[PDB]
């Protein structure tokens, strides 16, 4: 046989990116996976070449970031690529998970793939939070303080857990040093989970935007989806180059260029832009413990998703009401982000509570009821009696 098939190392390269049978009807929404892989490689390479100049002391963190942006040759390129690419990493990941919810890729036989995806999502949120605290600006310090006090809400144990996390009594030098070590560490766990994700994908192949089988008309990976992914790679690099070179500090928060001061609290403490729906979910609950439980349940309710989709056809392509309520859900998630960006003021508390309820109601009540009604409507539309 061929050398790409008989060699031990090149057989994986073959069976994953050369001769992988892909369904020939998949559109550009089946390209966000390759795009996330490229953006992860961007994050790791800029992280290494920018962490060769970073000193993680609490008295030397912000000065070393400014040393990167001023004294290091092309260091502004590195930091701006790194922060804005983390923003694009979460945006492409949100689009990828929306592709997962829409076309029904969570359903059987792809439950393992969906669960490893949710694990990757949790690890990526953790990585972004740790790296945002490594800047040690104003928002970095106070966001670390608020999230660890949320961990202090745990009954009978929590204060000692938080003194363990801090490595002291408040967010201090051991906290920033261990956040830098963990933040260097967790992306390699993300890379291992990505390899496990690709294995759980490869044992059944991709889905298709129709929700029927794709075993009939398969076309290879090579040259076809290689050049289709090359198209979206160049578009992604174009938009990233715009938001790096022409308007770099748009997505960030301007308070993060104030150095970390434990005495001055800011006027409005807000995380970076993508953690705002989860921050709104947590802020909508009038309790600390139930708030933390609801914030983690807002990700575990993605795990309870394949067991509630009672639709007998895969994906929302050929269904009306499920497609409508899907876009209700997407614009609700955007409204959660925008509620979280605001203050704790009338009527944003009541709207945050209603928006959290519509989030959990979509994942727990709306999907099974609308899928059951859509099944019975498909049946009685064509069966006569």
């Amino acid at each position: 046989m061929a050398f790409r098939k008989s060699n031990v190392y090149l057989s994986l390269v073959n069976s994953y990116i050369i001769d992988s049978p892909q369904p020939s009807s998949i559109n550009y929404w089946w390209n966000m996976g390759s795009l996330l892989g490229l953006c992860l490689v961007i994050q790791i390479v800029t992280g290494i070449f920018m962490a060769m100049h970073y000193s993680s002391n609490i008295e030397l963190a912000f000065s070393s970031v400014e040393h990167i942006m001023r004294d290091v040759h092309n260091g502004y390129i590195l930091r701006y690529l790194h922060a804005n690419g983390a923003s694009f990493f979460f945006m492409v990941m949100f689009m990828h998970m929306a592709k997962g919810l829409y076309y029904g890729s969570y359903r059987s036989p792809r439950v393992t793939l969906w669960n490893v995806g949710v694990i990757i999502f949790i690890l990526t949120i953790a990585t972004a939070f740790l790296g945002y605290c490594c800047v040690y600006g104003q928002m970095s310090h106070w966001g670390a303080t608020v999230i660890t006090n949320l961990f202090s809400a745990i009954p009978f144990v929590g204060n000692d857990i938080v003194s363990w996390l801090w490595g002291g009594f408040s967010v201090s030098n051991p906290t920033i040093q261990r956040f830098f070590a963990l933040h260097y560490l967790v992306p390699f766990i993300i890379a291992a989970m990505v390899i496990m994700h690709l294995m759980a994908l490869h044992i059944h192949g991709s889905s298709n935007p129709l929700g029927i089988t794709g075993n009939l008309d398969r076309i290879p990976m090579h040259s076809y989806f290689i050049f289709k992914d090359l198209v979206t790679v160049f578009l992604f690099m174009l938009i990233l180059a715009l938001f790096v070179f022409y308007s770099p500090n748009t997505l960030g928060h301007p308070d993060n260029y104030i150095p970390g001061n434990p005495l001055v609290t800011p006027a409005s403490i807000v995380p970076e832009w993508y953690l705002l729906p989860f921050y709104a979910i947590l802020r909508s609950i009038p309790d600390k413990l139930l708030g933390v439980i609801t914030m983690f349940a807002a990700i575990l309710v993605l795990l309870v998703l394949p067991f509630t989709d009672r639709s007998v056809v895969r994906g929302n392509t050929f269904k009306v009401l499920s497609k409508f309520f899907f876009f209700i859900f997407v614009f609700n998630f955007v409204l959660l982000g925008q509620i979280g960006a605001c203050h704790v003021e009338v009527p944003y508390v009541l709207m945050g509570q209603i928006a959290t309820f519509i989030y959990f109601a979509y994942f727990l009540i709306i999907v099974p009821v609308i899928s059951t009604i859509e099944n019975v409507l498909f049946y009685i539309g064509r069966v006569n009696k």
């Binding site: 076809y224 198209v231 160049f234 690099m237 174009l238 180059a241 070179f245 104030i258 003021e345």
Partner: protein, 248 residues
């Protein structure tokens, strides 16, 4: 919050360095440094700007050297361990007027004057906010506002009550090039200078952005052509189906 705690919205001034192609006005940066040194530098440190960054940007080599040699820095001690001073050089940083935080809070009624190395990048609005902050002091506060004594009013500061004094008056500095140095002229010059101090890469960032956007747009259109090319055997593929003989 009300609009008073949030502060009034700074408007859209048409700077000479907005837009994706316009660079800084380096004569305005030179005049902004002059207004900095003669007004701000009594009370604002500039701790992150080295002297060598001004060489070739707003001043020549000998000008930066003869401005840095007016200041004293800590030399390595002599052969008896006695601490000694030295005149400045190109590799040092611009020194602040205050030796520590407590001297600053003592000399400014408790309020700490923030370091202005990143102050146009650490405020929302940015250039427009700094310009409207400087040129925004009313002659008298609006009726019904009880200021705490020792504080001043301008609506652009969040809360209304600021601890700065109005420090831009008509013709308090003289310009080297003979430009009429009104308040708005000096405020525009220092805001351009602080934009340089926060973003010294700004010129090279925009030209490398021009190169990168041109090359990636050309690559994106070329890749659209090659994708439409190599998929042409699959887009135009056709299927006919005559149903087979049912005896088999």
């Amino acid at each position: 919050m009300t609009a008073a705690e949030h502060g009034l919205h700074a408007p859209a001034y048409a700077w000479s360095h907005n837009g994706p192609f316009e660079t800084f006005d380096h004569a305005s940066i030179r005049r902004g440094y002059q207004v900095y040194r003669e007004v701000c530098a009594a009370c604002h440190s500039l701790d992150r700007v080295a002297w060598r960054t001004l060489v070739g940007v707003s001043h020549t080599n000998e000008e930066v050297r003869n401005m840095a040699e007016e200041f004293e820095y800590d030399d390595e001690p002599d052969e008896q361990g006695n601490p000694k001073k030295r005149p400045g050089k190109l590799s040092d940083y611009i020194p602040g007027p205050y030796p520590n935080e407590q001297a600053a809070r003592a000399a400014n009624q408790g309020a700490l004057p923030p370091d202005l190395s990143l102050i146009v990048k650490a405020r929302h609005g940015g250039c427009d906010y700094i310009f409207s902050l400087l040129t925004g002091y009313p002659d008298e506060p609006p009726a019904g506002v009880a200021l705490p004594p020792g504080s001043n009013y301008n609506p652009y500061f969040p809360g209304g009550s600021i601890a700065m004094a109005r420090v831009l008056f008509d013709d308090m500095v003289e310009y080297e090039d003979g430009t009429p140095a009104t308040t708005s002229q000096m405020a525009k010059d220092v805001t351009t200078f602080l934009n340089w101090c926060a973003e010294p890469e700004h010129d090279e960032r925009k030209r490398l952005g021009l190169k990168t956007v041109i090359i990636l747009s050309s690559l994106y259109l070329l890749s659209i052509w090659v994708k439409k090319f190599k998929w042409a055997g699959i887009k135009t593929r056709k299927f006919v189906f005559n149903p087979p003989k049912p005896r088999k």
